[PDB]
Design a protein around this nucleic acid. Structure first.
Lengths: 93, 130, 306, 124, 125
RNA sequence: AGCUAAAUAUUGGCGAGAGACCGAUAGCGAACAAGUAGAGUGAUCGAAAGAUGAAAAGAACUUUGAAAAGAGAGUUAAAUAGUACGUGAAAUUGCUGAAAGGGAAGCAUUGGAAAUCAGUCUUACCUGGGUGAGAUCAGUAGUCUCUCGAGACUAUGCA
RNA sequence: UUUCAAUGGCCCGUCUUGAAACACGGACCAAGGAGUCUAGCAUCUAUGCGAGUGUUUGGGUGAUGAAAACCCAUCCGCGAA
RNA sequence: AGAGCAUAGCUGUUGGGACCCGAAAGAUGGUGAACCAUCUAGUAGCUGGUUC
RNA sequence: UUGAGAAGCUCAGACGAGUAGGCAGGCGUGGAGGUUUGUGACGAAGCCUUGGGCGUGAGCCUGGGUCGAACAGCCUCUAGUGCAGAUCUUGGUGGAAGUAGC
RNA sequence: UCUAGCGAAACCACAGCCUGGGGAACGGGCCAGGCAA
RNA sequence: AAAACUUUCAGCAACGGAUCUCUUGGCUCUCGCAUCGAUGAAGAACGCAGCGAAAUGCGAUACGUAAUGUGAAUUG
């Protein structure tokens, strides 16, 4: 009875495996894309250099003022003030 | 070379480094300590005062006042190197401040001392739009 | 050099050779200075020739980069695309919905709020249940949305942003990096509800134009100048940088125009790397690949795609 | 039978805080006049067999499972019939490739994985 | 398995032999395969490298790109291939080296000594 | 008075094969310029010292500096490999942030506070029907390996 | 984890001394660093054989390391008296 | 109406450089009373140390 | 009733200071024969870290960061195998100290 | 004497207000005390 | 009570060169063999390279010649 007892348990425990394998397949479970230590490092270093070669504050500076120079706004925007708009008028003419 | 400050990328800053400089480490630390946070032009004037004995560097950790000139001379080139590196970037000169300075021990071969300096800007933009 | 195996010898051989290399480099620099100060034209021609190289200049040649002259074929293709409703006379107002991964944490809920801060008129619904992304996009199509943003978070750290264009627009999948909240930014500011002003720079390549085009579709077409809030998307070596700022102009002597604005970072601040562009709603398996980056090819640092 | 421990804090070596050449690994103080070895007040404790935990609870994680170290995907299969008492610990050097094979197999098997989110990343 | 006591099986002694070998012993250490159609034409497997031998690189960053052997650099076990170069800092070309057992010989430089070597090893032209 | 092979010895010399041997404070005094530098009138004594990388691709060029060097910039898979070069521990020192700081500190218990991690899960089970299915089921037909029937299948119908 | 609050706790090792007192040794960190190798004797236990017992001086042999393994001639040692 | 013999281990003991470190040596032979090299692992009841 | 690693499982009671010393079971290091049809460029070994665990404990397993070419669990074999001291050997480094001073 | 410049060795368990008592010194740590900035 | 100074903890940079991996080296055992010099040995010194720092090599025929081979490289 011990030997037949252990086989029935395994049949019970194997069926629950097969059931769980079925339900997991049905659900659209997420993939598990791994992480590489070489690509993570190389992209970490290449990025830091880009920030240095991006010049964010300078690039947003010069192109925004040229946007103001071209005047994408109306007659006079609410962000600008008259003190500096006078130099805007002198420079643009 | 990777520095010791989270700033000093191309944002608003320029660097400068000194390696194995033939000056006493203790003097450089005290010189660095007093000039930290001052305006760049203000620091230049103060260093001149030290040469002319108009002002003396306090000695707090390594102890009161003194007038070292060799360590100040080493710092003069580094600060001059600092602003020369600022110009290459093309920053706004009149608002330079000494945001960071650090003196580190060197190999025991006379006690030399690495020196680094970081110049930066101070800015505030009003939100308004209330 | 490396021929001699003794350690202390090869150091003395190098240091002697290093000093000699610096000495003759000195004299050639000095004589060049002596002759250049004598003839300023020699300095002029050297400067006009000896331009230091850079990755952008040494970039490998690819034909997809568009010329400065706007080509009619491109505009013909792009005047009837998915986003054309936002660019035509229709002037569609885009509403955004931000979701997370299944059973995420509160880290995103304090970063997606910063995202929502930079995106006025953009709802948010925390993902609940067994609903998949291809089912959210269908639901948002009839609800009245335009684009859908998902902030995947795992190990209590957000790492991937995928966004799809409703109803059947292309889907993009970026991997965020250096995502710093507004608190972790020095001299941060508090932002209001004013509509930010988009700025998109350095998107020369054709594929980059499309990715820039979708991001433009993500914003309200009518900026609020009075709030003067600026959102920056800048691509440099494929690393798209998203930043926010408040700009107030000042009188700057360095800038030859005479005016230059001070900037104050508002948050957030993060990177993206375009991992894959899909056609149709984002499906990990059964989608159509507009572009999927080979990781071995990116090692050619002078070659780009955005 | 719940997971209850007779003590949380570790046993540190005596005077291990003062010195750095002295390691924090517990070493029995054999000093002849050592009052700390002599169990005075204000001193530290000392490992005794009286500190052992319940024999039906020894090696049990706070959630009741006993950690079981699985090297490869063969090892995760034999925990088919002890999933209610053992938890598949993934070895530290198992690569991210086989690490997913171990977690996906263990998820369907019904067993609990303790470090299922290491070196990997989900994608929806 | 080795059975002769005339041969050795020592990492220390075999490496000593490899890097202590002079050029007339290094010329056999630097051999190259032959192209499959040419391998069966002469019925020989591999031949030592030689200047002015047309070869194709099979492994490395320079895989596939063909050429000849400008000069064989015996003292470091390298093959210098024309047009297989590298852009230095100063814009010049520092030609990278390929080991002799990676490339494949496509067109040999037919010397009188090579012909005898072919027919010596039970071969023919 | 005389010689005489082989069996035997062998920390040297000419080579050779191995090792449950040491793995750069070890093993030789010497993995390298090793009895070498250097010390001593002299006889003698006598060290320290291995590792960039696949490739030198060893940093052009611009700029500051009298230079030395620095900053841009470049190469590289990576410069958290820049020749003071593999990994880079502890002691030790400098900068920053934090809290604490009436002649010590120190640790132990008990908490509190700040700061931070532990782990979260209704979902499955059972039952009811319909709908299409499949087979280990056919009041069914064949092949294969075993030992009638036990497997793996190929048709065919889905009761 | 840092810190605080209340309660507490005379520097460790050696040596000395009933005990201390002591006198010593200790600026800090890393690495190195001390019952080992062998012949003889006796004891206990384990194994093989048992009025026996023990191949390895040596010889035979070993084609795939052959300095291993495997095999036994003439003595001999210790027992038996 | 013999119970040993042989191998391996453990602990013990006696030698051997004999757990590690530390006492002026002495002798032989050299170098220019001095100094050097070896015999030498010369000698200890003693001293200090002897590791999860 | 499944509870035969009979070296297992189970039941009951009392007991618990410790030097010299006696006995027993274990943890750890280098290498050796067997083994895990073991791990490893999708990252070995190592290293740091207020990440999480395990053991009375020696010790162990794991997350993150660096890192870049090897390594380990189990059964036995084996030894130059475990440190806080020895005015210990070697290297490094401080206070003293910018002091004695030159 | 000051200012520059060049710059040790010794020593180092760790410290450092005493008052008394604390039996074996106890004061350099223990308890009662004051002090303690 | 903040700063300064003093203290602990964390980040970062120096300092140092342990750890880990190896390794044209050491040590150990076995094995084979017999070979210096008045025909100038061992040793020493001075020389010698298209340029060598040591280092090897070589002797005014100098980092060697003749001869036998191999057959196209030396390589800073």
């Amino acid at each position: 009875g011990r030997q037949i007892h252990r086989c029935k348990q395994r049949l019970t425990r194997l069926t629950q495996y097969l059931l769980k394998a079925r339900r997991l397949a049905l659900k659209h479970q997420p993939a598990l894309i791994p992480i590489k230590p070489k690509q993570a490092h190389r992209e970490a270093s290449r990025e830091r250099k880009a920030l240095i070669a991006a010049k964010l504050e300078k690039n947003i500076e010069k192109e925004l003022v040229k946007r103001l120079k071209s005047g994408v706004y109306g007659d006079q925007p609410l962000n600008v003030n008259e003190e500096i708009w006078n130099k805007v008028l002198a420079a643009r003419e | 070379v990777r520095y010791s400050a989270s700033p000093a990328l191309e944002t608003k800053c320029a660097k400068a480094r000194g390696a194995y400089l033939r000056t006493h480490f203790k003097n450089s630390r005290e010189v660095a300590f007093t000039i930290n946070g001052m305006s760049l032009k203000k620091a230049f004037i103060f260093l001149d005062n030290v040469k002319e004995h108009k002002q003396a560097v306090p000695f707090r950790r390594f102890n009161q006042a003194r007038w070292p000139v060799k360590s100040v001379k080493f710092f003069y080139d580094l600060l001059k190197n600092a602003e020369a590196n600022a110009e290459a970037k093309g920053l706004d000169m009149d608002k330079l401040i000494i945001k960071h300075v650090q003196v580190n021990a060197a190999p025991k071969q006379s006690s030399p001392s690495h020196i680094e300096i970081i110049v930066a800007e101070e800015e505030e933009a009003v939100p308004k739009a209330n | 050099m490396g021929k001699i195996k003794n350690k202390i010898v090869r150091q003395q051989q190098y240091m002697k050779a290093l000093h000699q290399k610096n000495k003759d480099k000195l004299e050639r620099r000095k004589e060049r200075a002596k002759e250049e100060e004598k003839d300023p034209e020699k300095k002029r021609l050297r400067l006009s020739e000896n331009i230091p190289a850079t990755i952008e200049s040494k970039r490998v040649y690819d034909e997809t980069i568009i010329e400065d002259k706007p080509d009619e074929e491109l505009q013909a293709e792009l005047k009837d695309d998915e986003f054309s409703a936002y660019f035509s006379e229709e002037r569609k107002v885009p509403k955004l919905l931000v979701t997370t991964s299944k059973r995420a944490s509160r880290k995103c809920y304090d970063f997606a709020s910063e995202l929502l801060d930079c995106f006025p008129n953009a709802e948010f619904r925390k993902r609940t249940g067994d609903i998949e992304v291809h089912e959210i996009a269908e639901a948002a199509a009839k609800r009245g949305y335009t684009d859908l943003l998902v902030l995947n978070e795992d190990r209590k750290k957000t790492n991937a942003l995928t966004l799809v264009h409703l109803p059947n627009g292309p889907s993009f999948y970026f991997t965020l990096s250096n995502l710093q909240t507004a608190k972790e930014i020095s001299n941060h500011g508090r932002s209001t509800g004013h509509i930010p002003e988009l700025i998109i720079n350095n998107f020369s390549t054709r594929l980059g134009m499309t990715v820039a085009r979708a991001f433009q579709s993500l914003f309200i077409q009518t900026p609020q100048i009075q709030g003067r809030q600026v959102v920056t998307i800048h691509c440099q070596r494929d690393f798209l940088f998203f930043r926010r700022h408040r700009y107030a102009f000042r009188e700057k002597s360095n800038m030859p125009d005479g005016i230059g604005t001070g900037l104050q970072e508002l948050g957030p601040r993060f990177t993206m790397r375009l991992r894959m562009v899909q056609k149709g709603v984002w499906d990990r398996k059964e989608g159509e690949v507009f572009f999927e980056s080979n990781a071995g090819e990116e090692s050619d640092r002078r070659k780009f795609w955005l | 039978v719940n997971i209850i421990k007779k003590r949380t804090k570790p046993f540190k070596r005596h005077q291990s805080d003062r010195f750095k050449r002295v390691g924090e690994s517990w070493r029995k103080p054999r000093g002849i006049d050592s009052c700390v070895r002599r169990r005075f007040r204000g001193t530290i404790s000392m490992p005794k067999i009286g500190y052992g935990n319940n024999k039906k609870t020894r090696y049990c994680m706070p959630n009741g499972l006993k950690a079981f170290l699985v090297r490869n995907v063969s090892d995760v299969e034999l925990l088919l019939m002890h999933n209610k008492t053992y938890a598949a610990e993934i070895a530290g050097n198992v690569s991210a490739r086989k690490r997913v094979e171990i977690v996906e197999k263990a998820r369907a098997l019904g067993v609990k994985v303790t470090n299922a989110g290491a070196k990997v990343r989900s994608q929806e | 398995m080795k059975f002769s006591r005339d041969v050795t099986s020592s990492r220390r002694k075999q490496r000593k032999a490899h890097f202590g070998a002079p050029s007339s012993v290094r010329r056999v250490l630097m051999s190259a395969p032959l192209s499959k159609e040419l391998r069966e034409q002469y019925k020989i497997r591999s031949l030592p490298v030689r200047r002015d031998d047309q070869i194709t690189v099979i492994r490395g960053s320079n895989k596939g790109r063909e050429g000849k052997i400008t000069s064989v650099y015996r003292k470091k076990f390298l093959l210098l291939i024309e047009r297989v170069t590298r852009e230095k800092a100063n814009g010049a070309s520092a030609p990278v080296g390929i080991d002799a057992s990676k490339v494949v010989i496509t067109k040999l430089h037919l010397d009188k000594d090579r012909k005898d070597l072919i027919v010596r090893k039970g071969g023919k032209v």
